[PDB]
Design a protein around this nucleic acid. Structure first.
Ligand SMILES: CO[C@H]1[C@@H](O)[C@H](O)[C@H](OC[C@@]23C[C@@H]4[C@H](C)CC[C@H]4[C@@]4(C=O)C[C@@H]2C[C@H](C(C)C)[C@@]34C(=O)O)O[C@@H]1C
Ligand SMILES: Nc1nc2c(ncn2[C@@H]2O[C@H](COP(=O)(O)OP(=O)(O)O)[C@@H](O)[C@H]2O)c(=O)[nH]1
Ligand SMILES: [Mg+2]
Ligand SMILES: [Mg+2]
Lengths: 197, 158, 816
RNA sequence: UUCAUCUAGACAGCCGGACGGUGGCCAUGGAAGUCGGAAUCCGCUAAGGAGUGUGUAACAACUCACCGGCCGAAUGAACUA
């Protein structure tokens, strides 16, 4: 255990005095496939390091003697945050990081940000799927051998979590009002932390 | 022109049954016969070893394109005399595919893989071969991985 | 009609464009026998009923059907909803053109509604939908107005899903909608129904509003938006308090208001609203309180006898306009023959084509009026007719008969009307025939009249029980009833088993129990008992007779040495399907065994006989070397082989796939000492010993069963199969439909109550068909009493009165 | 009593992730982690079993091992009588 913790500390040291600049990337709601894609993209340009916030804070506090600059990075290790080190123009790495996104589908239970709508469209779905629409109260008619929503219908409202039937119909209709990707809280650069902006 | 997208796993160089063809593709008005023939053509060299078959429905278009399936590639390289279902059940696989061949499979997988190095993708392919249980260069794929880890199998990273 | 007149109904029959012969189909208890009854109320098994209905010129104009006149005659069939009677609906479907699909508003589109609707779509019959028990929705579930509207929406959506999934690509626009007027809503039991077309017509009389496009605004999302006078097309929030749709505001609201008032007993408001809704009163109906007042006031303000009949007249096609797109499928012959095109023509002057479908009883045992629909030409009382057989080959002499007609009959609500003639496209009974036509067929006057369809159905006889009369002297009565119902009920199947037992077969437990009750009480008239059928097994060998079986004659002068071998299933198949035929010649029939069956040409040439019955799948082969008198005992050996292949040594059942190899014989020189009496017992005992040393085994008959069950019920299919030892052979999906098709080999042994188990596991959605395929060898020993094949033999021994133990190989074997 | 976890943040709780090679090999009529036998690999890794369960005919879809966010000082397991 302690050996693995020491290994993480040493790797953090390596990054801290091998990469002039880093980003503090927020990973809330970010999946693992997204993470692998991001690591693949930033490969060559940047490196990605995650850890336990307490681990990172204690490691830093113990390296502060040699590198007292990261004392200003210390108050930014909060929440689901990691470190993306780089030796490349800031803007490029920032753009790539906040460019890798995923329209995450509707998982039942998640608080829907904004009102989910279904529109009067020919969904191109096999008629058998009518069960889902009838369960959500979505009027439909079979045209050209495909399901077509007849009338606009607010599936769920802003606020109240997406129920299971709502989620099923949403995943059916590819409706996904969840966009997840790394955010950027701060950027450390040459002993100087500053907001992303 | 709408790009529709569907897979199968029909056995290598084995005529695909219409009972396992029509349900998927049949909806968009294409003959299970012709698609099955396309699968056979795309799996000619793959004979015996199942593989994924990407099929793009571009306005009712039978564009069979075998997706490289790691295990399928591994065993087609194993080259074993055709695995005959009739002949014997539980056909085992022991193909001795050389390190170079495994690296070729790795370079045909790297594009659709995540391993940092070509060495890493070789490690992935060796793990697949270990799953298969076949012998490789008179040694286990796990020990090959141990060699790569300890810096013994200098990988031709290309 | 109050018995208008016989000649008036003859004239109405002669009218071939204002007559509609349709059938009401629905789920069990969905209210078809009440809607049909409410239609026959003002009109004064499946027996057609007649209703007279006048009609206006405006809505004869509003008809997309070739017609002339102003009065219509409805011939209505009440098909049965049970899945066990799914052929009594198919027969009416073949005889009819229109389908009134009743769907219950509470229960929705149930399993049997889906089944009968898929059958109508298989026959390409256009359905019109009626949503029943709205009174139940209004008094039990207390839907306000929008829950009821949404239930209607879901019902229509599900029916449309079925029709759009199972509509053949010849109509396309057969999808059902209230918007088009093809969906009604009402309470059959209470006697009221409506169509939104009827409401859009009832409104013009007071609003001056258009009817053409209000009948598609009264359904769906369409909002009159009062206080602003504009038929808006979306909710728009009504600037607060979102307003209601046209359906609820205009059609349902007066209905719900009359319901609320009359069920709340607001006697100060009942007359006011009744006058607003223009009803008429009676001398004492004014003293009618709730739970029947609302009933009568809605039976006046909204007559189901009019709402149903108007859509029947309008959207349900007549014969002369519907037979066209159905002749090509009701005639297997090519589309380029005069008999084929005559049905499309619906001409009453061409060659006759009359399809008897139902053997209607006649209050007398054995006269059996013949219900049927005429399709081409005119029938005559005493016209020369040609009976056609369901398998009648038209080229040569087959089930074609040269009798005539005795009297035309029109059937009514259990009474017959004697008629002399009727043109095409009509419904009449044929008196004087059907004692020459077994179940179905056609009756023509042409000489190249290829028969029309065999009237296939989705169900089959799958429940089989054996029956027997207690008083063996009254057995003629048993068989007489057993064949007097096999023609009355269409789907009942009876025959004699491989063990000598009358096997009554039927669709399900309910259909079978009805048939058995008819046997016990009415048709036969003699008390009989029912049992599970005895499964007739076969005896066989699965080894090579480890030591040579030997038998010595009673005089001990003659000896037989033989062995037993497992003739292959393919060889046995070649035997029973004639590829290897007894009558054939050796060294020509033996070449086939040598080239194509792995046999040795010498052995195949040395075939002495086939058994049992002289042509069975068991063989005897002379493997002997030189023997002085072998050819003189040949007849005795073949007789003993016939005996030993008919009565095996396990339980006396016929042998199968047994090869006997006579390796050696030792015959006395004098023919008097090697006669039949000395060789037949010797040879049969030697064959028995060979059987009981070549690993004796039994084979049971295996059904091949194919089931049309959907995705949700395929798991119940699998559970029933692997609980009853079934083997999953092949699954498939029909093109575009969800209905699966699973084929499997189910042993006949574990095949009783199997259809009931499958229907319970699948919720009635699985539809099996079974037929004897082959024989499977039971792996377990039939000699050990407690072995899984070893108890069926014990049961057979007990039921046959033989002993309990099996005579061991030490018997039938003379030690040498 | 013994063995463990724990301010380099423990247990419980709530929330986020729980991947890719990969439909791993074999079979199965079908078997994709989850009816079975066998092998228990590798990468990305903060972390993820060739899979703890629910589920499908197979899918899918949920869920847990595993790692994280919050809290902050103790806690868990097997035994003994
Ligand atoms: C139209 O219906 C057909 C077939 O479709 C069906 O297979 C049914 O099966 C009857 C049996 C046929 C089997 C073969 C002839 C050999 C053994 C026979 C059976 C067993 O004794 C198996 C099924 C079930 C019957 C026993 C259990 C009474 C059979 C019989 O006829 O005796 O036969 C009727 C006539
Ligand atoms: N409340 C109500 N009951 C009904 C209606 N239609 C049928 N029923 C009830 O259903 C029962 C049997 O229905 P029935 O029509 O004979 O069954 P069927 O064989 O499907 O026609 C009767 O006792 C009726 O009371 C209806 O419209 N409303
Ligand atoms: Mg009834
Ligand atoms: Mg499973």
């Amino acid at each position: 255990i302690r050996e693995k913790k020491a290994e993480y500390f040493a790797k953090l040291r390596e990054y801290l005095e091998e990469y002039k600049s880093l980003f503090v990337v927020g990973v809330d709601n970010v999946s693992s496939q997204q993470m692998h894609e991001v690591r693949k993209e930033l490969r060559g340009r940047a490196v990605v390091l995650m850890g336990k916030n307490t681990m990172v804070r204690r490691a830093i506090r113990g390296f502060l003697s040699d590198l007292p600059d990261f004392e200003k990075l210390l108050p930014f290790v909060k929440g689901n945050v990691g470190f993306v080190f780089t030796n490349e123009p800031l803007t490029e790495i920032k753009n790539v990081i906040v460019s890798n996104r995923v329209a995450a589908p509707a998982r039942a239970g998640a608080v829907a940000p904004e009102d989910i709508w279904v529109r009067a469209v020919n969904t191109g779905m096999e008629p058998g799927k009518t069960s889902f629409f009838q369960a959500l109260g979505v009027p439909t008619k079979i045209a050209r051998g495909t399901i077509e929503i007849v009338s606009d219908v607010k599936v769920v409202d802003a606020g109240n979590k997406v129920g299971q039937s709502e989620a099923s119909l949403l995943n059916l209709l590819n409706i996904s009002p969840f966009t997840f990707g790394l955010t950027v809280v701060q950027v450390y650069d040459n002993g100087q932390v500053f907001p992303s902006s | 022109n709408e790009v529709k997208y569907l897979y199968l796993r029909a056995v290598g160089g084995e005529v695909g049954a219409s009972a396992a063809l029509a349900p998927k593709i049949g909806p968009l008005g294409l003959s299970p016969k012709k698609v099955g023939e396309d699968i056979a053509k795309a799996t000619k060299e793959f004979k015996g070893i199942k593989v994924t078959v990407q099929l793009k429905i571009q306005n009712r278009q039978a564009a069979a394109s075998v997706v490289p399936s790691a295990s399928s590639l591994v065993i087609t390289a194993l080259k074993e005399p055709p695995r005959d279902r009739k002949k014997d059940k539980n056909v085992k696989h022991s193909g001795n595919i050389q390190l170079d061949e495994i690296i070729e499979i790795a370079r045909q997988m790297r594009d659709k893989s995540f391993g940092r190095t070509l060495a890493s993708v070789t490690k992935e392919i060796l793990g697949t071969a270990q799953s298969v249980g076949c012998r490789v260069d008179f040694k286990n794929p796990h020990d090959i991985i141990e060699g790569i880890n300890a810096g013994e199998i200098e990988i031709p990273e290309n | 009609m109050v018995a208008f007149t016989v000649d008036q109904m003859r004239s109405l029959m002669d009218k071939v464009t204002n007559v509609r012969n349709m059938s009401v189909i629905a789920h069990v208890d969905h209210g078809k026998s009440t809607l049909t009854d409410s239609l026959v109320q003002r009109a004064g098994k499946s027996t057609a009923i007649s209703l007279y209905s006048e009609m206006s010129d405006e809505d004869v104009k509003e008809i997309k059907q070739k017609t002339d006149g102003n009065s219509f005659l409805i011939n209505l069939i009440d098909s049965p909803g049970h899945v066990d009677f799914s052929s009594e609906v198919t027969a009416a479907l073949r005889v009819t053109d229109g389908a009134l699909v009743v769907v219950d508003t509470i229960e929705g589109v149930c399993v049997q509604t889906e089944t009968v609707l898929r059958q109508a779509l298989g026959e390409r019959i256009k359905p019109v939908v009626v949503i029943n028990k709205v009174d139940r929705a209004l008094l039990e579930l207390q839907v306000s107005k929008e829950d009821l509207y949404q239930t209607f929406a879901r019902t229509v959506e599900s029916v449309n899903v079925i029709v759009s999934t199972y509509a053949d690509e010849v109509l396309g626009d057969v999808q059902v909608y209230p918007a088009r007027g093809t969906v009604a809503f009402g309470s059959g039991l209470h006697g009221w129904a409506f169509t939104i077309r009827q409401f859009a017509t009832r409104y013009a009389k007071k609003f001056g509003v258009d009817k053409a496009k209000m009948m598609d605004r009264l359904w769906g999302d369409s909002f009159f938006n009062p206080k602003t006078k504009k038929w808006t097309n979306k909710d728009t929030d009504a600037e607060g308090k979102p307003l209601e749709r046209a359906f609820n505001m205009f059609i349902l609201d007066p209905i719900f208001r009359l319901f609320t008032a009359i069920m709340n007993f607001k006697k100060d408001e009942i007359p006011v609203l009744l006058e607003k809704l223009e009803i008429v009163l009676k001398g004492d109906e004014k003293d009618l309180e709730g739970k029947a007042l609302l009933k009568v006031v809605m039976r006046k303000f909204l007559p189901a006898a009019d709402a149903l009949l108007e859509m029947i007249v309008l959207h349900l096609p007549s014969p002369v306009t519907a037979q066209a797109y159905r002749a090509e499928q009701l005639y297997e012959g090519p589309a380029d023959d005069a008999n084929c095109i005559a049905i499309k023509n619906c001409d009453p002057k061409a060659d006759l084509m009359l399809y008897v479908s139902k053997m209607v009883p006649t209050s007398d045992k054995g006269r059996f009026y013949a219900f049927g629909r005429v399709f081409a030409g005119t029938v005559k009382s005493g016209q020369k007719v040609r009976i056609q057989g369901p398998n009648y080959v038209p080229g040569k002499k087959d089930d074609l008969f040269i009798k005539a007609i005795q009297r035309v009959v029109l059937m009514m609500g259990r009474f017959v009307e004697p008629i002399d003639d009727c043109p095409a496209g009509n419904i009449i009974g044929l008196v004087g025939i059907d004692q020459f036509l077994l179940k179905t067929g056609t009756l023509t006057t042409s000489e190249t009249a290829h028969n029309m369809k065999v009237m296939k159905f989705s169900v089959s006889p799958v429940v089989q029980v054996a029956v027997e009369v207690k008083n063996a002297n009254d057995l003629p009565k048993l068989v007489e009833g057993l064949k007097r119902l096999s023609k009355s009920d269409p789907c009942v199947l009876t025959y004699m088993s491989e063990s000598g037992e009358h096997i009554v077969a039927g669709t399900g437990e309910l259909h079978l129990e009805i048939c058995l009750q008819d046997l016990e009480h009415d048709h036969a008239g003699v008390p009989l008992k029912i049992s599970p059928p005895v499964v007739a097994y076969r005896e066989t060998v699965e080894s090579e007779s480890s030591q040579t079986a030997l038998s010595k004659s009673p005089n001990k002068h003659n000896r037989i040495y033989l062995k037993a071998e497992p003739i292959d299933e393919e060889v046995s198949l070649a035997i029973e399907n004639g590829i290897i035929n007894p009558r054939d010649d050796f060294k020509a029939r033996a070449r086939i065994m040598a080239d194509d069956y792995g046999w040795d040409v010498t052995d195949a040439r040395k075939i002495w006989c086939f058994g049992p019955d002289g042509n069975g799948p068991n063989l005897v082969i002379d493997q002997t070397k030189a023997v002085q008198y072998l050819h003189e005992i040949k007849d005795s050996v073949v007789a003993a082989f016939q005996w030993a292949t008919k009565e095996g040594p396990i339980f006396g059942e016929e042998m199968r796939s047994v090869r006997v190899n006579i390796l050696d014989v030792t015959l006395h020189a004098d023919a008097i000492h090697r006669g039949g009496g000395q060789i037949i017992p010797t040879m049969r005992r030697a064959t028995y010993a060979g059987f009981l040393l070549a690993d004796p085994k039994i084979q049971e008959p295996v059904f091949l069963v194919e089931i049309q069950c959907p995705e949700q019920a395929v798991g119940g299919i699998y559970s029933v199969l692997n609980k009853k030892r079934g083997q999953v052979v092949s699954e498939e999906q029909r093109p575009g439909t969800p209905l699966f098709t699973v084929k499997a080999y189910l042993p006949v042994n574990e095949s009783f109550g199997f259809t009931g188990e499958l229907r319970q596991a699948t919720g009635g959605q699985a539809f099996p068909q079974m037929v004897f395929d082959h024989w499977s060898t039971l792996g377990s020993d039939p000699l050990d009493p407690t072995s899984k094949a070893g108890e069926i033999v014990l049961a057979a021994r007990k039921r046959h009165g033989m002993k309990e133990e099996v005579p061991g190989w030490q018997e039938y074997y003379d030690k040498l």
